[PDB]
Design a protein around this ligand. Structure first.
Ligand SMILES: Nc1ncnc2c1ncn2[C@@H]1O[C@H](COP(=O)(O)OP(=O)(O)O)[C@@H](O)[C@H]1O
Ligand SMILES: Nc1ncnc2c1ncn2[C@@H]1O[C@H](COP(=O)(O)OP(=O)(O)O)[C@@H](O)[C@H]1O
Ligand SMILES: Nc1ncnc2c1ncn2[C@@H]1O[C@H](CO)[C@@H](O)[C@H]1O
Ligand SMILES: Nc1ncnc2c1ncn2[C@@H]1O[C@H](CO)[C@@H](O)[C@H]1O
Ligand SMILES: [K+]
Ligand SMILES: [K+]
Lengths: 330, 330
């Protein structure tokens, strides 16, 4: 038996969420639909201009772990918070979902990471992230026994921003592969790919990463192309399995020369797209670690992702296992 | 001119919100639909049993102030938080709504109040409140110029729980009445009325309170009766104006022998009833301080309350002024 189906590793963040008008993004020089890194001074400034907000536990990988647990899989998470009230919220929410989470805070300062997420009327989300205690995640936070005992270890491209997180990921890759497990990553954000293009390709080509998740813009950015077909051909050459999401157009799963296209589910409306890709990865990785076909992994991903975009907050509040059962994915 | 339409005073609280099944309330001996006071130990215990949650600024009077500001009125608030992350969230949200909020935290311990609110499938809410820093609210927190310059000062019956808050309220009553203003209270919760029945009646009969808000159960509890008609007759005798809410059956406004019945909005589904009474008071007090008829005040209260019960969280995230305009309440 294995203790875990999916271990995820990422920046532990609490989301601060508010709807805004289109002009707010322009006035504040926020890049729409992207992850904008900010310092402490900028965080205070944007917060002072932000309307009344809702808080919810976030973090890309955190959301993915939570989603796997929600669907019925056994998940674990590595990510560093501070010993503060935001850190206590993060710790509560992930553990309450039944994700193994044991990363120890190193003190109260830097404080727990937070992201101010502005949701426009079209449902797009523009994130503004102060990394705080995330800068302290390092090799010391690798629970080797967990990596040793997880079918898949999945991490964020976003980990390349903080200084030492990459060292932890290399340790995970080694331990995972020594125990015959598989490694996975998400490209995270198109600008993040702009920052770490060469390093990400190296992870894939050296075999440190087996399964890669990308959205359309991330895939395009990885190869600096406007040709989506080229991006699909190249990503298939660079990793063993690629899952490329296409928003309302669903997803395509690639393995060697195999291609499996999956449709998006029907939705009421796009309330808030925050978490879409994260939950696609939840459903995909849940199906994968249950031995399901790649097409069925894509279907489970589309189901979970389509549910999360119909609610405020990045982690489904409803039962994904019940939704999977009703959709006959079971 | 007056600087303020409505000043409100209450327990400054951050809500921690989760849905639960019916059995959860029974297993944890939580009184359904009520405000359950808890100590720090019980707070830790219930949190450990609570599922993944969302946080939103709460506090009955805080919500009411926010509601007034959202409708287009000029609002102020007194309530005490701690110098901690929860306190910073509370301070941000109320000020971001355009409510004057200047009460100074006194330190980091006790920490900012929080309420674990469990929402059942019927939309009912069951609150479990650790008062924290709310116990420090006292006469030192009365900004006398604000009370002098507010058309109505409104406070919670809930303030009778912490030790010194009532002294601040009596100071407010004096100042308000010396400046020709009006005083208002909500009975807050049926058990709260059970605890402070004699004192609440004294506030009304001595003329410290001019305008009283009650729901059906609070009114019944006030006179320890099962006869709703008796309760209406008695509450009308005991205060100048009474606004009595009846959930799906709307409300009734009483003044002397005058009675004004107002219909509730037809609701597709009750998502979360948290905030209903608070936002009824927003709309009523907004209308009242705009010189509207008592019926129209009731209509505005019903419109705001109906909006807040159709969303998760106790402060409407949509424009109440726009809704009022569409409804021809303007
Ligand atoms: N408008 C939409 N309608 C239906 N499903 C959607 C929509 N947008 C996203 N999804 C679902 O979320 C998945 C990931 O969305 P995408 O926007 O590509 O991800 P990311 O969050 O990584 O940008 C899609 O494969 C799809 O299943
Ligand atoms: N099921 C419902 N349908 C429509 N309106 C409702 C419903 N429940 C509450 N309301 C609105 O909220 C107001 C106050 O609700 P009530 O349940 O009496 O308040 P409280 O929050 O004080 O218990 C009502 O007067 C009505 O306008
Ligand atoms: N730099 C970051 N690293 C990891 N996750 C992030 C970052 N910035 C924002 N997020 C998270 O991305 C999620 C949506 O994919 C949000 O829940 C938010 O917390
Ligand atoms: N003891 C209390 N005093 C004042 N407000 C409270 C109390 N307990 C819970 N609340 C608030 O009541 C609101 C709903 O009326 C919630 O937003 C919650 O914060
Ligand atoms: K969402
Ligand atoms: K609500």
């Amino acid at each position: 038996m294995t203790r875990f189906d999916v271990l995820t590793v990422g920046n532990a963040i609490v989301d601060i969420i508010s709807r805004c008008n289109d002009q707010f993004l322009i006035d504040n020089q926020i890049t729409k639909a992207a992850m904008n890194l900010i310092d402490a001074e900028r965080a205070e400034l944007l917060y002072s201009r932000m309307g009344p907000a809702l808080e919810a536990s976030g973090g890309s990988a955190g959301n993915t772990a939570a989603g796997v647990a929600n669907l019925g899989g056994k998940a674990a998470y590595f990510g560093n918070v501070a010993a503060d009230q935001l850190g206590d919220i993060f710790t509560h929410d992930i553990r309450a979902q039944g994700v193994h989470y044991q990363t120890k805070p190193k003190g109260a300062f830097p404080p727990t990471a937070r992201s101010m997420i502005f949701v426009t009327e079209d449902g797009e989300r523009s994130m503004n992230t102060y990394l705080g205690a995330c800068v302290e995640l390092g090799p010391e936070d690798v629970e080797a026994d967990v990596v040793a005992d997880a079918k898949v270890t999945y991490f964020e491209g976003y980990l390349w921003d903080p200084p030492r997180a990459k060292e932890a990921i290399l340790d995970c890759a080694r331990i995972a592969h020594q125990h015959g497990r598989e490694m996975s990553m998400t490209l995270s954000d198109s600008f993040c790919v702009d920052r770490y293009r060469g390093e990400f390709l190296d992870l894939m080509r050296s075999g440190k990463v087996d399964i890669v998740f990308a959205n359309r813009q991330e895939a395009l950015s990885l190869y600096q192309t406007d040709d989506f077909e080229e991006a699909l051909n190249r990503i298939a050459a660079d990793c063993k399995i690629a899952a490329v999401t296409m928003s309302e157009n669903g997803a395509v799963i690639l393995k060697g020369r195999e291609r499996y296209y999956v449709n998006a589910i029907r939705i009421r409306e796009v309330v808030d797209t925050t978490g879409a890709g994260d939950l696609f990865a939840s459903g995909f990785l849940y199906g994968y670690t249950q031995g399901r076909s790649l097409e069925d992994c894509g279907k489970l991903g589309c189901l979970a992702a389509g549910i999360v975009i119909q609610q405020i907050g990045p982690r489904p509040m409803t039962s994904l296992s019940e939704a999977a059962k009703q959709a006959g994915l079971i």
